Design a protein around this ligand. Sequence first.
Ligand SMILES: Cc1ncc(COP(=O)(O)O)c(CN[C@@H](CO)C(=O)O)c1O
Ligand SMILES: Cc1ncc(COP(=O)(O)O)c(CN[C@@H](CO)C(=O)O)c1O
Lengths: 405, 405
Amino acid sequence: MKYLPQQDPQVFAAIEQERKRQHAKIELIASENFVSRAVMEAQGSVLTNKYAEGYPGRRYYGGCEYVDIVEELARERAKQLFGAEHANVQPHSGAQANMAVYFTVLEHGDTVLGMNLSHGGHLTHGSPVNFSGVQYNFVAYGVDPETHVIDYDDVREKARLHRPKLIVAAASAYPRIIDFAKFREIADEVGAYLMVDMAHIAGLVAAGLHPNPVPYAHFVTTTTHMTLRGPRGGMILCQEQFAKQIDKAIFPGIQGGPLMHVIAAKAVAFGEALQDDFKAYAKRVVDNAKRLASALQNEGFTLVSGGTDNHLLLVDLRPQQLTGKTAEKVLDEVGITVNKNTIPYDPESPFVTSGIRIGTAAVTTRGFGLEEMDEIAAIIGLVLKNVGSEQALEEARQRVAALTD
Amino acid sequence: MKYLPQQDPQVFAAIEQERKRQHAKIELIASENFVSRAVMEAQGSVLTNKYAEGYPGRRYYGGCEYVDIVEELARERAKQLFGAEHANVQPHSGAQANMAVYFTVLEHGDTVLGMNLSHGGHLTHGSPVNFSGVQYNFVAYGVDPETHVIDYDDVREKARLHRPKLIVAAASAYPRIIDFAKFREIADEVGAYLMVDMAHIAGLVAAGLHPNPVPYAHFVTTTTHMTLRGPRGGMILCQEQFAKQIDKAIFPGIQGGPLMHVIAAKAVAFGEALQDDFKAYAKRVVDNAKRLASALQNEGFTLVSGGTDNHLLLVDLRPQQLTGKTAEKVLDEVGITVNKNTIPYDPESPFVTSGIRIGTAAVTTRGFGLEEMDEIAAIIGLVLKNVGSEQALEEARQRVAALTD
Ligand SMILES: Cc1ncc(COP(=O)(O)O)c(CN[C@@H](CO)C(=O)O)c1O
Ligand SMILES: Cc1ncc(COP(=O)(O)O)c(CN[C@@H](CO)C(=O)O)c1O
């Protein structure tokens, strides 16, 4: 940076901090990643500078000829990535992407069927403190109590019982492949629309490592920042038939001027995802997650669903008599970042939990491989199995620092 | 840029374009401005990298110690700037800032009283194609047919008649000072809350050139990008009493993870606004707008409300028998960017209009002064008074290029 350090030492110090922290810690928060310098340069550009309400070639302001090129690049690279008929790259976030689909297809009070929030469903899928649960009538389907795999029979009974206008599939804490074909078949049974929120698995979908929801869903929403490793923001994919309504839901519907600099970073991240090495990267993400899961079970940990099909895993800490809140704090003491996360049928409340959610997308980006996964699992074992030992904690800290350089 | 040009020539070319366009054109869109390099460097940082749902010291993720410093800097610089009891610097946009206040104070279907959309009220103030007008019952107050000044008697009658739960003051196309004390007095008369959307005038408010709404309103919303010259995003200011509810409206209410890199650019823009030269700059903005208004009237143009008290002006083109759509296109032909904009009591529809909206915040940022204002008005006169003359247009183009270097 050149001008920031001189103009704002305080903000620059905190940023420099955050940068060093990102390097020093072992980042295991499943929704995180590290973007590339080109993505950051696109967001730090003068595109931040333009009002561009409307869409390419149909703007409400003159002078949009060049930001229209950037948006169309993003839209077209998305279409290439996911095969969707239409993309809207304006959502300011995953939340806004979900909110626009709900604005489009639902009337206030309508019934929506989503994944149980304590089984993997996201906040934007019906939490009662969230707009989604406040505006609409959300009902949930759950995972099997023993396999922790979505119970498709439960999805179907719930759809048939409650007759939702919309069915939402996908999650923020579900370690197994989701069967989009089954959800769509149930939606058609009850005449509901199908929305897939692939935020967590978008990069895996882009790399062919997770079934693509695009051909099954009427709408697909996602963040551009998790496994897709783009800037922080959202995107909606949908069939051509809903194209105009989704675009109008985004604007003049729920947003105003779009973030064109972010939309330029989206196009840049999409370009990266279209390359072969992003595919090699995603592959390592999943390989790494499997490796880490295996290694954690080798250490004596129980995993929700017994393992993972994607970038993430959930540790059930009941066997070690730990709450997720406790494990998260002790791991934070040695430089390992995870999230507490409720486990299906959790006896503890959401603010305490019986599990920790872990993902490998960030460490994979930084170059960690299977041997690092083994080490990280051994570190987690030493810590979580010896919570009151300061020597275990010190040893773990030294082993964390050996990993992060 | 270093990595963008190599990794993504297509996106880099379009960005480089947009940068050159910004320099070559005479940017008169009233909501635009140019941010500083330090603001851009903060948005192009690794802060983009962190999940930070929740607020400083009350996050839902570990590792937020340094992004909490950046957020608290933004919040505290905002509080210093505007004198508000609480700031929420997470709104992703002016739209999201307004949406969170509406989520907080209103139940679906509630009555809200806002400024007539064709008299200066914004889209997020009740447009029927907007979430605001779809979710709630919006009623409007207008400006006087001859002075084009908000009719406070009309505001009061409308409040007393419709008994709104909320009253919204401010606008995207109102060239005169708004009387926040009168709005609050009316709100108290009918027991309504008072929301001031100062997006357009925030920088003028920050510089003491526009009465501050903070002491009169229960809630104040704004974009961080217009006269405030920050990155593109929103902010909500409010009394301490609504602090928790507004924060919860933002999260877990209507958004998800905040844009911490943008929040760092907000703090940087707030730091700039706190300096003396930002005050000198705002002063020039208003001086320039007055100058330009005067000069336009010298050329024979009628201005809505007969002039301006702020950064913006509205030309009523009926005297020249032009629609705003036509004037916007002919000005675009010579390198001058404006917006068509309905004028109060406009005979034309919103897609055609009888006026052009103009502001001086961008050209002032670039250094234009009173002599440039005189020249720009002379250029606009030559063009709009000789629409079918190609020689007038060519002459204007040369005079535009003399201004932009
Ligand atoms: C499946 C899923 N969908 C939407 C979002 C919201 O995205 P924002 O950009 O944050 O609005 C999420 C977010 N997930 C976060 C926690 O909410 C995470 O760490 O998983 C999501 O998971
Ligand atoms: C008064 C006012 N309030 C909110 C907004 C919305 O902000 P976003 O960041 O764009 O969501 C605006 C926006 N004004 C734009 C046109 O909508 C402008 O050019 O005035 C606003 O004016």
